[PDB]
Amino acid sequence: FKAFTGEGQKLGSTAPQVLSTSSPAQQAENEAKASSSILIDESEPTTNIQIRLADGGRLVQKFNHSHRISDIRLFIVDARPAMAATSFILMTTFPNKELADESQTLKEANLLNAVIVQRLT
Amino acid sequence: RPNRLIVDEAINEDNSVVSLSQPKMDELQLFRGDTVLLKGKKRREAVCIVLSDDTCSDEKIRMNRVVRNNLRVRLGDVISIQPCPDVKYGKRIHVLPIDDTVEGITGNLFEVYLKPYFLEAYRPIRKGDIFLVRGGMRAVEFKVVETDPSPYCIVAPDTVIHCEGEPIKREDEEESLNEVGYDDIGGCRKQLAQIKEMVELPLRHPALFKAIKPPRGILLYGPPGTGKTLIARAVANETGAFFFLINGPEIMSKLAGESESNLRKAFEEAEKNAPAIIFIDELDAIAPKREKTHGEVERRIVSQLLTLMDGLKQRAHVIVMAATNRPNSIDPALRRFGRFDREVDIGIPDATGRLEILQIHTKNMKLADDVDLEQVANETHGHVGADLAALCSEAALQAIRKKMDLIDAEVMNSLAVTMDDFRWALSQSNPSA
């Protein structure tokens, strides 16, 4: 009853993962820079949204409500410039509704929580 | 302790969602869509995802049947929940089917059931978990034997899934999901809640009644086929109470003395398995009206039933329930205080009830986009749960017979029932009430 036998063809298509963005310590430094670049309103409450990446995320980041999804879309690229050349799409989970519109604020999108997972675009 | 929560039924039918109250979510610092490592009774661990629910008490945690069984936990128990951010995208995940449900079913159990269920949803998974996948008008179970990150894992579009066939046998500790559950009954939600409030505490916390009266007789009545037996079976299953079915015709078939002995031994056995539930099906068949009975042996058996039921008083934690059509259907002195002192009216399911029953019976069925159960449920006047099940089965049969003109699980899942099939079955409904 060996559990390592045979094979099953791939579930999906090829995923172009490179992770050529330097040692994760550099990623953390750039994430800190981007976080400091986030303008905290000081009035509306603050929430930490953690993000999952294909290779692995866990990128916890505090945020506000007045911002737009464009804010996170830009912050992710700042912390991961390699994503600048690689278009990214963010979707919630259960339902896995794709988050398309960016002009809507986080309050408008009522997404103040960790349903931020990255998929290839 | 904040992590301690009382299990409760889940409205969300998804197999991997745990509903919690928003106050409790924020108090626990749990963000919807995050993984959680539930701790069961016998060191059982279930990895699921938390979701907010306004209609949920803070201590109450709503769960699906599958997760409950995976944790070997029943409603009203206490479970520990904590975030488990340490989840990796496992690559090698080995899942196997269960023989008792895939027998006579051919075609690779992938691209048919496993593939659509997983796809890209990122369903969390733990080693040894059991989950149910619906398709091809059948509910196939699967056991997660191994995962690349031992033991917790989450499927990913880059995860490699191995399904090497060879269905595994069901171990006795595990309780098959084919058994009736609280979600298998629709329409009589009010009566079902009444039954919970009536019988849950004696069975779940017997020590309280032995120390600190309890209801001993519940008379379920209504048109035949309304699922009364279904109700009793479900109740027994969630409360973990021994179930003993005493079919009225079975007793009446036995000759004089043999029938009374059988009834007596059934009660004694049920008593020896306390806590237990005795379902006296078709009670009118055993104890009809005084005018209807015209035989010494029947009056003797009725007297014997009354004497045994009275003897139940010195016994305890044994609940006897029976099925009939109307209280006046059975002879008097059976509704006297004590014996069958409580009554419940299942009645006929309403439009919402019929919709719920149809959904329950069509879970495995693949219906076309044009098929809408609400419109038909509105049309289906005076149908009993048995009638609704038969109607759905007839529509399925119509679709299958139509396709035969042109078993492989792929072919089975390929065909889908259409609204025309439902309309045709409707024309052949033959209502019973």
Author numbering:
A (entry chain B): 250 to 370
B (entry chain A): 22 to 233, 236 to 429, 437 to 463
In the authors' words:
The AAA+ ATPase valosin-containing protein (VCP)/p97, known as cdc48 in Saccharomyces cerevisiae, is an essential and highly conserved protein involved in numerous cellular functions, such as regulating protein homeostasis, endolysosomal trafficking, membrane remodeling, chromatin regulation, autophagy, Golgi formation, and others. Its core function is to unfold ubiquitylated proteins in an ATP dependent fashion. Previous studies have established that post-mitotic Golgi reassembly requires presence of VCP, as well as two adapter proteins, VCPIP138, and p4734,35. VCPIP1, also known as VCIP135, is part of the ovarian tumor protease (OTU) family of DUBs, an essential family of enzymes that remove ubiquitin tags from proteins to regulate protein homeostasis and function.
We find that there is clear density for three UBX domains, with two bound to N-domains in the up-position and one bound with N-domain in the down-conformation (see “Methods”). Although the UBX domains from VCPIP1 and p47 share structural homology, the p47 UBX domain has an additional helix (aa 273−286), which allowed us to assign all three visible UBX domains as originating from p47. Using AlphaFold354 predictions of VCP N and D1 domain bound to p47, we were able to fit in the highest ranked predicted model into our density (see “Methods”). It also uses a phenylalanine, F343, to occupy a hydrophobic pocket within the N-domain defined by VCP’s V38, A142, Y143, and R144. Additional interactions are mediated by V364 and V366 of p47 UBX domain that engage with F42 and Y143 of the VCP N-domain, respectively. Specifically, L260 of p47 further stabilizes P178 and L182 on the VCP N-domain, G255 and E256 interact with H183 on VCP and F253 SHP approaches R113 and E167.
